[PDB]
């Protein structure tokens, strides 16, 4: 019913900065707004309640202001741990509602990913599938292009990528790229190569292996 509109949707700032997050209520809620911080697969942690009361457990670099229609959460000395989604929630009026969140990224110096490759285990082949896995470890920024080459030829629609949420200690991301062929097709070919292009790399790096060996 009371709609809460958070701004901006995403934010990226360096250690030491101030993050400024807005929340707008469609109708007056007096002072009764709370803020929560939510890391990846964790419960929300309550930061502020009633607009500006800093809660039990929370460092003073978090603060809040506003009333009625407009509210602002401020985070003052961005540390790497500050990575999260941040939600506002009105506690004034039934029914109780939440904003859609702001996602904060914490900047760090550019880091190129260490890249490793894994051939399928012999054990998976025995069941008629092959999973070739390329791992890009601890990189910043998040943008990275992975290209799969089977016998010097490009691949398409046969790889899947998964990225971890930004680490909370060193602000890096990691990425998995997974090439899935049939056993038949796997043994049909010799050289498996994962080609990684990333801003921390002067030139695209390749990791590869000769089938079996």
């Amino acid at each position: 019913e009371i709609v809460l509109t958070q701004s901006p949707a995403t934010l990226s700032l360096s250690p030491g900065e101030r993050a400024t997050l807005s929340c707008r209520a469609s109708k007056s809620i007096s002072k009764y707004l709370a803020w929560y911080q939510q890391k990846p697969g964790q419960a929300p942690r309550l930061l502020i309640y009633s607009g500006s009361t800093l809660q039990s457990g929370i460092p003073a670099r978090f603060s809040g202001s506003g009333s009625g229609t407009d509210f602002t959460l401020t985070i003052s000395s961005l540390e790497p741990e500050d990575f999260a989604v941040y939600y506002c929630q009105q506690h004034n009026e039934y029914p109780y509602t939440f904003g859609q969140g702001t996602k904060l990224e914490i900047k760090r110096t550019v880091a190129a990913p260490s890249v490793f490759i894994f051939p399928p285990s012999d054990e998976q082949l025995k069941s008629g599938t092959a999973s070739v896995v390329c791992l890009l470890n601890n990189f910043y920024p998040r943008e990275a292009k992975v290209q799969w080459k089977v016998d010097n030829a490009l691949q398409s629609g046969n790889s899947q990528e998964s990225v971890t949420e930004q680490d909370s200690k060193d602000s890096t991301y990691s990425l998995s790229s997974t090439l899935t062929l049939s056993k038949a097709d796997y043994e049909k070919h010799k050289v498996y190569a994962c080609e990684v292009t990333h801003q921390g790399l002067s030139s695209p790096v390749t990791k590869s292996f000769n089938r079996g060996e």
Binding site: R45, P95, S114, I117, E123, S131, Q160, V163
Partner: protein, 222 residues
Amino acid sequence: QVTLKESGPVLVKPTETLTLTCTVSGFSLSTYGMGVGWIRQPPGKALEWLAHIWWDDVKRYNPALKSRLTISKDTSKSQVVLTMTNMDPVDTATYYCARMGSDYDVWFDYWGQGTLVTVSSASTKGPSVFPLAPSSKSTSGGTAALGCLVKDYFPEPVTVSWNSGALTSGVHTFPAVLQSSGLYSLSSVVTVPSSSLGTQTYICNVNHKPSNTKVDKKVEPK
């Protein structure tokens, strides 16, 4: 002190009924001012308030879903229960229980860790677990990477740990992707010193509650 824990991860069939228990300790579900609420979160989506109950048995429900919801408490058992009828694939979400932080205002100060409810008519299936063995093609000077690929299970979640929780640094467990077969797949990976690959045993522990399967796999250069 104050804790709360949601009953384990459940798979619920379309149209059926979900039943969740929150088990509380550190306070009484009948002390003045104490209250417990349920809030859910669809994947990649916002938080949503479901219902809460107070010490004196007063109950509040989301009006949009009111027709489908029941909430109750039993003080001697230290449990709050949530019943949601006519489940729909759209109800697939993480379900939290939380305590209110005041005796009046509805905001939450302590939270359970959440339980993933998946609404689907598909059957549970436990994972196959394959090694991703360390080699020279995973040994980039002084440091080696190894893992386990955890494959072909349903529903989410799966929990993966290394040497029963004694290895936590360098561990990346990637989000599952839902494959064309309608089963999830993921890798859990870890980086360790090279010198230790002949010494230290590395095991991945893969727990899949919905299908009641636990797998241990040793990972070894080969």
